[PDB]
Amino acid sequence: NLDIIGKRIEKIKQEHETSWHYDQDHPYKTWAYHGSYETASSMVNGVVRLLTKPWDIIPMVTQMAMTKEKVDTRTQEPKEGTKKLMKITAEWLWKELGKKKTPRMCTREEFTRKVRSNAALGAIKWKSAREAVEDSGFWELVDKERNLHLEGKCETCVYNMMAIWYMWLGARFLEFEALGFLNEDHWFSRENSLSGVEGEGLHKLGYILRDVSKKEGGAMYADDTAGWDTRITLEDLKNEEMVTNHMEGEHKKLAEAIFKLTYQNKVVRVQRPTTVMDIISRRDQRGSGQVVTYGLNTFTNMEAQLIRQMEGEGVFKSIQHLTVTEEIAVKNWLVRVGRERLSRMAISGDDCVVKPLDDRFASALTALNDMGKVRKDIQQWEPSRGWNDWTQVPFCSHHFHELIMKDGRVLVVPCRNQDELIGRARISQGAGWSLRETACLGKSYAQMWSLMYFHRRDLRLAANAICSAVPSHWVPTSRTATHEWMTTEDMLTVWNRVWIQENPWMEDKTPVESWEEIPYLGKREDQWCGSLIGLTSRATWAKNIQTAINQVRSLIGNEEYTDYMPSMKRFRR
Ligand SMILES: CC(=O)Nc1ccc(Nc2ccccc2)cc1
Ligand SMILES: [Cl-]
Ligand SMILES: [Zn+2]
Ligand SMILES: [Zn+2]
Question: What residues does CTP bind to (predicted)?
Fold first, then answer.
């Protein structure tokens, strides 16, 4: 307890001893309270909204721009059989993930390059992050903390809740130095992990699900856990910590301290309107950096789903206790079929798709519920609803269509309801956006639509309009998946590289010569997925699109523009 968190608590108190009140009205039940002390809406993208006028009267789009009691829950201890299944499975999984990879420290050099390239390091004397890393003063702060971690102690690694937990850059760097290798060296790639998809773009994911569908077995299951991060047990944190068993020297001690001090024993500051800063502490739940959180969520989800598969296949009879011969059976299953079973899955952090050996999986719920990974929007003991067609499975907020080109070649394309796509592109995060920076964010969305959602009539038209309205040489940006659309290269050349040249599922490498060779969904399928084709509002928009393009060009001013509309049949004279 305070033997590990006390110093951080003392430092904060001393910096506010002029306001330190132990409020007895404090709401926290499951978070430990220590004391208090005296102490960001969405903006509309005008370039995208002016070029999507028909959506101005669709509430599912317009209401997206307008505007915890789950974290203060507790997770019961799993049973002895459950804790044994998890320990055996976790030990085996870190060894498999580590067969072709070497754990290693990430460096000041690597960390500084990431900060000077703008990435959500989730950080809070110095203005921007770029100021700290260019100041030898900061690194002495990092050194002090670092030598403290080697000492087995922590002073400044404190979470700030807003459910994203920001930390100071120094604490982030240290986290990155010890555990960044998981992401930087692609431990959760489909190559290294078999069930992972780390570094797979949206253009990959449908082909991966179609490959899982080719396996013999039951339905495809895609059960979402309710508030996954709140359901991470101290047992899960212990099993994740076993990656340090694969490390040596300094690195091992440094990683052991991140897990011990900042993951298994957290200090958090939360804003309460009642304005008193509450310094609360808890040992369980996930609160790490987003990138580390993604890799460890993928790890613990892969472990949980292999255990659900073992339950369905009858590898163990009861979670209450594993017999000695059940342990050797579990071990032997992993060694014998573990890799083949990992391949029957697609796992992206807390999101999974599983094609088990058969449908006994649907009612194999005792380990899943006892690990605390309770399914969303279904009764605790009701059997899972499976999907019979890989094209109807949800994954990473998408579904996937099989689309046949006029020349016979097969595209597997990502898709989601079109209101969600338009509504997101109409939103910008942050202050001080110039008109040029707003235009370049609109161009980023347009180019993403050309590459990923070209098969949606409305998005190919709106993408071409936005690209026509923004000066041709202005570079797409985003302050906030492999992002092939972030480029000033011709989008037809990028489309060819992504969908033909580099696509391992396309045997014929004949390049496409024009956008007219690139197909759409069926007209009726496009409407099912939210297209406005067939409405009067949409027909007037499409017919008059040059007038909308010219409105935005007039606002931006005398610049160099390209007309992309004649790349579409209906504007080709
Ligand atoms: C390029 C292209 O195919 N555009 C297109 C196709 C059909 C409609 N209209 C419509 C749709 C579905 C059902 C009844 C009418 C409008 C535009
Ligand atoms: Cl189905
Ligand atoms: Zn620390
Ligand atoms: Zn669709």
Answer: 227-229, 297, 376
Domain boundaries, the chain: 1-38+107-179+234-283, 80-100+189-228+290-390, 399-571
Which among 133, 98, 103, 137 has a CA at the least distance from the CA of 119? 133
Class of the domain covering 1-38+107-179+234-283: alpha beta
Residue with the nearest Cα to atom 9 of ligand 1? Answer: 534
Point out the ligand 1 atom lying closest to the alpha carbon of residue 568: 1
CB 556 within 8 A of CB 470: yes
Orientation of helix 457-469 relative to helix 418-425, angle to 10°:
20
Domain covering 80-100+189-228+290-390 in this structure, CATH number: 3.30.70
Whole-angstrom Cα distance, residue 542 to residue 245? 61
> How many whole angstroms from 526 Cα to the centroid of ligand 4?
7
> Which residue, among 210, 199, 191, has the nearest Cα to 411 in the 3D structure?
210
For residues 222 and 345, what is the distance between their CA atoms, to the nearest angstrom?
Answer: 10
CB 72 within 8 A of CB 29: yes
Q: Is residue 458 within 8 Å of 472, Cβ to Cβ?
A: no
Alpha helices in 375-434 (DSSP H): 418-425
Q: Which of 461, 527, 533, 567 to mutate to test the pocket of ligand 1 (most atoms within 8 A of CB)?
A: 533
At 80, list the tokens: 């002895």
Ligand that lies nearest to the alpha carbon of residue 415, given by its number in the listed order? 4
Q: What is the CA radius of gyration of the chain?
A: 26
> Positive or negative CA dihedral for 317, 321, 326, 332?
positive
Same CATH fold assignment for domains 1-38+107-179+234-283 and 80-100+189-228+290-390: yes
Calpha distance 239→302 (Å, rounded): 12
**How many Cα atoms occupy the beta-carbon half-sphere of 533 within 13 Å?**
20
Q: Which whole-number Å values give the CA distances from 523 to 78, 520, 534, in the listed order? A: 51, 8, 9
Query: Is 455 a known ligand-binding residue?
Result: no
Render 282-333 in DSSP notation, one character per residue: ESSS--S-HHHHHHHHHHHHHHHHHHHHHHHTTS-S-SS---HHHHHHHHHH
Helix (H, G, I), strand (E, B) or coil at 245: helix
Supply angle C-alpha 339, 93, 188, rounded to 5.
85
Q: Solving technique for this entry?
A: X-ray
Nearest Cα neighbor of 20 from 6, 34, 3 is: 34
Q: How many residues does the chain have?
A: 573
Sign (positive/negative) of CA torsion 124, 127, 131, 132? negative
Is 440 annotated in a binding site? The answer is no
Report residue 350: phi and psi, to 5°: -80, 0
